[PDB]
Amino acid sequence: TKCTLKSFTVEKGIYQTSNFRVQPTESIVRFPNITNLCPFGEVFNATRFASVYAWNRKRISNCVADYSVLYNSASFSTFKCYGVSPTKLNDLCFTNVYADSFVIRGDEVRQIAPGQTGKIADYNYKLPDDFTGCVIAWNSNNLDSKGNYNYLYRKPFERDIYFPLQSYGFQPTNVGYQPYRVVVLSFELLHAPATVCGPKKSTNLVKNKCVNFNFNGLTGTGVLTESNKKFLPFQQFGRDIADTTDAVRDPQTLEILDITPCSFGGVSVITPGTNTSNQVAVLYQDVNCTEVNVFQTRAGCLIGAEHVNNSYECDIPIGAGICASYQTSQSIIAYTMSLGAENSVAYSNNSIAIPTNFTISVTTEILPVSMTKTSVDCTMYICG
């Protein structure tokens, strides 16, 4: 409370200080149960790469991808990744991965990016502007040079198989005019079943307990529970209005789990003034007395306040007809607020009460009329 108010004195009242949040008890990792190592050797160590006018696409699926074996290979002159960072790839997984394999001149690697331009990007190898993937390249002048005029150059991922055709004199003595191999990996993140996943090992599943989960790279925290949601066969995830995932299908056992965020609420602290007592009571807002001088109000579980069967004027307001006060031997007490003294007016069809005397009361009413006329020199405030 003192830290919330940035003050060492706290005046009498109720203060929303802080947030109660049940913590993840353990971490849960769910990935498909498949163990084939992905055929990246048949991509990167192929005998000859294709010409860029007629590049080859290898589908990678139903396998485990150890991407650090690629990223750590000092032979790669670039490993630029776009919608993902190469360090994260082992934690994360995809429905498919597609590897595009071809040779280009070493000057031309700069054209192979989302939204880049130049004749190879314009004619024969175009990337999407919203591409998710990695572009990987290395000098192959030791292997693809001879020159080797078999290497020939001319929408996104369209194979465009005098006219716009040219070919390369790749020779070992060439520096820009040297051959480079390129692999472009495209990652299919879409909400189907994953089939190309990192080496990260699956745990067992846990239900009805708060956990730090990961399904197919979908990280989160929540209470996992069995659910009645009829996911159609093509659907792996279900979403909230806020886009946050609301339910999932387990990748090893195809059953549907609800995700519920772990129990949370505002922590209101009820205090007399610190210049009266250092005792306090705590209201866990909306929470029931289970996840947390204990009393379930309709405002939440109230702890450290003594429930009293009397009623008094509302001293500190808690909510839903409940108030608290500091009273005598002292404690904080919590009670239903009194609306006023009850009175049966002595009515009958022929009785009247007439006042035989008066009192001249003087009552004081206080009204705000003005406030401090501030003026801020916004250029001196902003720029000093």
Ligand X SMILES: *[C@@H]1O[C@H](CO)[C@@H](O)[C@H](O)[C@H]1NC(C)=O
Ligand Y SMILES: *[C@@H]1O[C@H](CO)[C@@H](O[C@@H]2O[C@H](CO)[C@@H](O)[C@H](O)[C@H]2NC(C)=O)[C@H](O)[C@H]1NC(C)=O
Burial class (CB in 10 A: 0-12, 13-18, 19+), 78: middle
Residue 155's binding partner out of other proteins, ligand Y, ligand X, none, with CB under 5 to 8 Å set by partner kind = ligand Y
In the numeric block, the tokens 């409940």 are attached to 322
Site for ligand X in 58-117 (CB under 6 A): 69-70
Q: Does 310 bind ligand X (CB under 6 A)?
A: no
Q: Does 244 bind other proteins (CB under 8 A)?
A: yes
Residue 41's binding partner out of other proteins, ligand X, ligand Y, none, with CB under 5 to 8 Å set by partner kind = ligand X
Q: Does 349 bind ligand Y (CB under 6 A)?
A: no
In the numeric block, the tokens 């314009």 are attached to 122
C-alpha 113: how far from chain center: 28
Residue 288's binding partner out of other proteins, ligand X, ligand Y, none, with CB under 5 to 8 Å set by partner kind = ligand X
Contact criterion met (CB below 8 Å) for 258 and 228: no
Q: Pick one of 4, 288, 311, 338: the residue that binds ligand X (CB under 6 A).
A: 288
Give the closest residue to 152 by CA, choosing from 142, 163, 143, 141: 163
- Which amino acid appears at position 10 of this protein? V
Q: Pick one of 9, 208, 349, 372: the residue that binds ligand X (CB under 6 A).
A: 349
Q: Pick one of 61, 296, 327, 336: the residue that binds ligand X (CB under 6 A).
A: 296
Q: How is 123-149 classified by DSSP, letter by letter?
A: TT-PPPTT--EEEEEEE-TTTT----T
Instruction: Report in angstroms the alpha-carbon separations of 266 from 16, 151, 248, 261, 367.
Output: 6, 67, 29, 15, 34
Q: How far is the CB of 106 from other proteins (least distance, A)?
A: 23
Q: Does 201 bind ligand Y (CB under 6 A)?
A: no
Q: Pick one of 59, 80, 88, 146: the residue that binds other proteins (CB under 8 A).
A: 88
Site for other proteins in 332-351 (CB under 8 A): 337, 339-351
Q: Does 343 bind ligand X (CB under 6 A)?
A: no
Distance (Å, whole) CA 96 – CA 194: 7
- Which amino acid appears at position 126 of this protein? K
Give the closest residue to 145 by CA, choosing from 100, 102, 101, 103: 103
Site for ligand Y in 146-165 (CB under 6 A): 155, 158
Q: How far is the CB of 298 from ligand Y (least distance, A)?
A: 32
Site for other proteins in 205-224 (CB under 8 A): 217-221
Q: How far is the CB of 132 from ligand Y (least distance, A)?
A: 22
Q: Does 78 bind other proteins (CB under 8 A)?
A: no
Give the closest residue to 136 by CA, choosing from 187, 197, 62: 187
Distance (Å, whole) CA 176 – CA 168: 12
Contact criterion met (CB below 8 Å) for 80 and 134: yes
Distance (Å, whole) CA 297 – CA 285: 9
Q: Near ligand X by CB under 6 A, which window of 156-164, 193-201, 349-357, 365-373?
A: 349-357
Q: Which residues bind ligand X (CB under 6 A)?
A: 33, 40-41, 44-45, 69-70, 252-253, 273, 275, 288, 290, 296, 307, 309, 346, 349-350, 353
Q: Which residues bind ligand Y (CB under 6 A)?
A: 155, 158
